Amino acid sequence: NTASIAQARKLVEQLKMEANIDRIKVSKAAADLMAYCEAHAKEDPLLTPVPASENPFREKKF
Amino acid sequence: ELEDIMSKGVRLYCRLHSLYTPVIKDRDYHLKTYKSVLPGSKLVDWLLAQGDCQTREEAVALGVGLCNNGFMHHVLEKSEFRDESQYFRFHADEEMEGTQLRNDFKLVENILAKRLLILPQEEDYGFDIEEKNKAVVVKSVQRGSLAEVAGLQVGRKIYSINEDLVFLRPFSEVESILNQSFCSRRPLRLLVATKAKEIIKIPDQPDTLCFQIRGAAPPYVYAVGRGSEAMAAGLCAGQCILKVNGSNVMNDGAPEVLEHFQAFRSRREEALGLYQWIYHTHEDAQEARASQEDSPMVTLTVDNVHLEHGVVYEYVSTAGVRCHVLEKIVEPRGCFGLTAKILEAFAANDSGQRIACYQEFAAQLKSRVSPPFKQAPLEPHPLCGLDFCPTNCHINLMEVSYPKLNPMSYTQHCITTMAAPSWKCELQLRRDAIFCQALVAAVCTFSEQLLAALGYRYNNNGEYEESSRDASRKWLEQVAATGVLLHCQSLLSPATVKEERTMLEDIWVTLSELDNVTFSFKQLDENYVANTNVFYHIEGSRQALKVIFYLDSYHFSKLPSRLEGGASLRLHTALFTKVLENVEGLPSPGSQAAEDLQQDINAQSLEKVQQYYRKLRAFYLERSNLVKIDQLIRPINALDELCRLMKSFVHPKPGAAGSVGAGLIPISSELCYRLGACQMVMCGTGMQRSTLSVSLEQAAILARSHGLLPKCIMQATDIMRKQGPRVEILAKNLRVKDQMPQGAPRLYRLCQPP
Amino acid sequence: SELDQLRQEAEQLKNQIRDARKACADATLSQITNNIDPVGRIQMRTRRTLRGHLAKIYAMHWGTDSRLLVSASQDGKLIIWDSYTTNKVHAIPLRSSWVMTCAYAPSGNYVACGGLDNICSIYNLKTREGNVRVSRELAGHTGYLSCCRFLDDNQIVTSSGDTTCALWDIETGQQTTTFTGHTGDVMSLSLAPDTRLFVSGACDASAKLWDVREGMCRQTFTGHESDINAICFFPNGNAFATGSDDATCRLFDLRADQELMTYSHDNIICGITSVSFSKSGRLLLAGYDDFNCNVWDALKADRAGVLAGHDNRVSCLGVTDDGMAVATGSWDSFLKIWN
């Protein structure tokens, strides 16, 4: 029973820490992720069709 | 001849690729190397040296029949088969090495399920289904019904009903399959999506507990009351409990699990609640019967014991029709109860220096079903009750369905995997231990084949457009008149491994003593056992022994009329042993004696099988004596051709010895599949060599009976061994030193990708 | 009762966390990124097919040089491949089979295997003898070891099957910190580009963002109805996506503390066995159980493309650190390098 007491108490302190942490709004979070994708959009060869001589899997000598 | 050429083509593929020094080695033509090719002159010369065709025109007629029937083809494909030194590549090797390509034998799903045998009730089976998220799940199960007695929970994705794969079928058609199965009153076997660990949020009623929890480490559900809220939450019987309410109790006992409930700490010894107790095993049920003659939720996660690991493949068959296969590996549910019954039967025969020891072992076996299979013992532990069970016993079933009211042709083939019966620890106790270890696997393979037959699934003769109903019925009267034959091919190496040599000597004397057991069926239907259909009862002595199979009303009404009157049914044995590797660095006389012992017991198995074949010929002769002979001439020449090839493998004439390689293992399996036989495959460990033989025999049965295209026979026997089932057996064991046989033939080797 | 009153204040904490997240829910990511230009079609084709395993592949991991990739077969071989020359650079037999995880150290000097033998073995590669030896067999877990990752050549975070994930140091061969906050079997982890925080997920549909230095769970994310099978961070470390057996990928934030976007199509009923992101993070690549790999637009939740090239299910998926190609290692002993 004391193991259940200790488990329940550590859950209590864990959720009070998870309640005490702070959080930004989802509009600012989505703006940050969209800004990151818009900043790194040209530097992604899976999205952007990279040339065959540039990617090492079609025509590059490496 | 020309209609038997598909059987002979699978047989010659299985005989050419399973010899050591390969005739299909890669050869260079016109300074262009050709992979896995066979010259026509060497093929014809090998056929005349083997004894397949007597003359060269017979051999080239066989070859041109093969090239028109798609087994092999000329590598340039501008020539038919002739007795030339031109290269003819097999289509299976061409598709495996990848030399317009379409894949026929593919894999359609991997599944983990649990079989639930449900007797039909008055209005329906006890449940109704629905199509939720493009699948087939249970819409509802009525409370107190036999469906929830079996353990059907709401929302589980159901895979098959009566060995028919429904998850690739439309919802109207699976509903029609259910209602026609109800109006024809079939006892419904079904497979539902059951995960390994289950979080059941049971209700805690304040007065009594509607469940029994027994065991030591872990504790298991010993019983559950019918129609209870425990059964509504999903606590079925036999489930081992790993954690209750957050607290880890897999190492804890039974009071340490019952104390978490509110009604047990109110009343301890008397909190059962007067329920209709269903149980886990029949021995637990009969022992309990002989003994008795807002809402606080408890969220506990249990381990779903007796789960079934399956893989559904599909392929275009020989005659165009698309076909499906489910290969399941199943731990035998009546393993520990079976060996417990054998040990108390041996104690009753002895009743004294070992009677109390044997009943203590039987109590140890009824005490818990935790693993639920005996893994190979790592430690030299003292004489337990556990080392009387078959080590690493598993049952590999294929249920194959192809279309031909919805006309389908289901079938169900059982192949029992087992590690060889060992005693790693007087000699009479040792012999009884290996006797029980073999006989439990014997009764489990015969039980799986017998319920497959009585469910009208078994078809040892599927080559001949024979439906599973009449094929299973003729197998039933066949096995009734002739007896049951246990073909158990050993893959162990007596020449190499000392413990495997004594394993083979022990299983040889074990089958020389086990061939006077008799399986006398009986009818006793008991609804308060969870899912089991057959209930065993072992009576008798060490020398003579009877196993009584209590079946249900349907599976006793479908039984042949001779054994319904309590008639005996003898089991004859057959031990075809062959080392999966060759012998490099030819050994001393101390290992030549082991090779001669392997040849001796292979010869005795050959004479026992031809004895059974003569008795089968006599039974078919008396059946034809009292269309039939012109339909039965076609299996009998194929099977005595297989008998001639077996005699060539076992006793070769002096002049060409060893030239067949290790081709006994496919061809003995083909012979004892054409013949009606229970086919156990054993080795020293249970995982690698055994799954090689299982994959080859299963792909051979699909290519032979069920018409798998011979382009895909090697593809099937490697997809089943790499990316199929029987890898979970390696998962659950994982503490053995088993490796794949390296000096094994190209058939019994894993193909490297191109 | 004291136990019930602390449970009631625990549900008070849960309800105030829930209404805090609903107060932070000012909009949704679909509403924010509705007006961006759509990705459309991602037509990546198989460029190489690493084919040398005799069993199901269960994990892969690239190197930070974006050239080598380690792969763990079910039978017990780690094959370290070159993705350029299609050549087995190394082949490592293991002492036990059924390894479910393999990790490539960022220095390139170490690989790590782990399976149901409850031991994470660390194999050294650049030895003077040239042979691959087992450096340390990190043992101490009781459950199966499910996902291991390298912070550097001494710190390895290993999820396990006793609801724990332990940070091990290799030179002493011990657990510097243990992370015990789960109730289910921990099925995945993924380090961040900051390499100071990581999200681990279990069968209880709870993804814990931990913190490796302080040693305690920073925050907790729910939203799934099945076992979370794979987690991967976004390339900035601010968000992470989980793929569970409920046929749903979910992109959660870390600074908004809740789910930002879900990814599910009605044609898809199969569970997700692997997830990762592109270099830009615009493409969430998810390896499903319908033998495929769908590439989702991670800002509009549209199925941008499908990669159907496997005969069995895709166990492991992974994008290079240069974002150039994605290795979709599957259970049919294939590692197709899509690009």
Author numbering:
A (entry chain G): 5 to 66
B (entry chain A): 506 to 604, 610 to 803, 838 to 895, 931 to 983, 1012 to 1032, 1318 to 1518, 1527 to 1654
C (entry chain B): 2 to 340
Quote the study's own text.
Phosphatidylinositol 3,4,5-trisphosphate (PIP3)–dependent Rac exchanger 1 (P-Rex1) plays key roles in neutrophil function and breast, prostate, and skin cancer metastasis (1–6) by activating small guanosine triphosphatases (GTPases) in response to extracellular signals. This 1659–amino acid Rho guanine nucleotide exchange factor (RhoGEF) is activated downstream of G protein–coupled receptors and phosphoinositide-3-kinase via heterotrimeric G protein βγ (Gβγ) subunits and PIP3, respectively. The N-terminal half of the enzyme contains signaling domains with well-known folds, including the Dbl homology (DH) and pleckstrin homology (PH) domains characteristic of the Dbl family of RhoGEFs, two DEP domains, and two PDZ domains. However, the structure and function of its C-terminal half are poorly understood, and it contains a large amount of low-complexity sequence. This region displays weak sequence homology to inositol polyphosphate-4-phosphatase type I (IP4P) in that it has a canonical phosphatase CX5R active site signature motif close to the C terminus.
We used single-particle cryo-EM to determine the structure of nearly full-length human P-Rex1 in complex with Gβγ to 3.2 Å resolution. We overcame this by collecting and merging together 0° and 30° tilted cryo-EM data to analyze ~900,000 particles and achieve a final structure with an overall resolution of 3.2 Å. Because the ~800-residue C-terminal IP4P domain of P-Rex1 had an unknown structure, we built it ab initio. The DEP2, PDZ1, and PDZ2 domains bury extensive surface area with the larger IP4P domain. Gβγ docks primarily with the IP4P domain but also makes contacts with both PDZ domains. The linker between DEP2 and PDZ1 forms the first strand of the core sheet (β1), fixing the position of these domains with respect to the IP4P domain. The domain is decorated with large loops, including a 285-residue insertion between β5 and αC that is disordered in our structure. Comparison of the P-Rex1 IP4P domain with the crystal structure of SidF bound to a substrate, PI(3,4)P2, suggests that P-Rex1 retains an intact phosphatase catalytic triad consisting of Cys1583, Arg1589, and Asp1638, although the final residue is found on the TI loop rather than on the P loop as in SidF. Therefore, in the P-Rex1 IP4P domain, a structural element within a canonical phosphatase active site has been repurposed to form a Gβγ-binding site. The P-Rex1 binding surface on Gβγ overlaps extensively with that used to bind Gα subunits and other G protein effectors.
